[PDB]
Write a protein that binds this ligand. Structure first.
Ligand SMILES: CN(C)C[C@H]1[C@H]2CC[C@](c3ccccc3)(C2)[C@H]1O
Length: 108
């Protein structure tokens, strides 16, 4: 079912619980897909996780470009850029004033 900006919905707060909130904007968020040097892949990188360049300012690396990626452990690993994945998402606001960007699957 279609979710629009201004709609009151239920979504996941930064504390991990579901609360009533308001959709404050529809937003396209870009995730990056890379191939690590061990042959493994990840398609959930933020553009800021590429530490060898400024992707927010200059855009994605070229397909096949060797990059340095800061992973979830704070460690930097070498990888090769594969693809950009722009996804329609929802920016929600809770009554404490906090805001998060959530996926369609986290909105009720
Ligand atoms: C998506 N993967 C399952 C996880 C990643 C990150 C944790 C190890 C890593 C990696 C990168 C480079 C060499 C060895 C190992 C980075 C890879 O396996």
């Amino acid at each position: 079912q279609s979710i629009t900006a201004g709609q009151k919905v239920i979504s996941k707060h930064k504390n991990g619980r579901f609360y009533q909130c308001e959709v404050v904007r529809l937003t396209t968020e870009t995730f990056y897909e890379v191939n690590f040097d061990d042959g493994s892949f990840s398609d959930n990188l933020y553009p800021e996780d590429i530490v060898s360049q400024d992707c927010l300012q200059f855009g994605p690396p070229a397909e096949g470009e060797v990059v340095q990626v800061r992973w979830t452990d704070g460690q930097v690993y070498g990888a090769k850029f594969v693809a950009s994945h722009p996804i329609q998402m929802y920016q929600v606001e809770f009554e404490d004033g906090s805001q998060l960007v959530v996926k369609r699957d986290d909105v009720y």
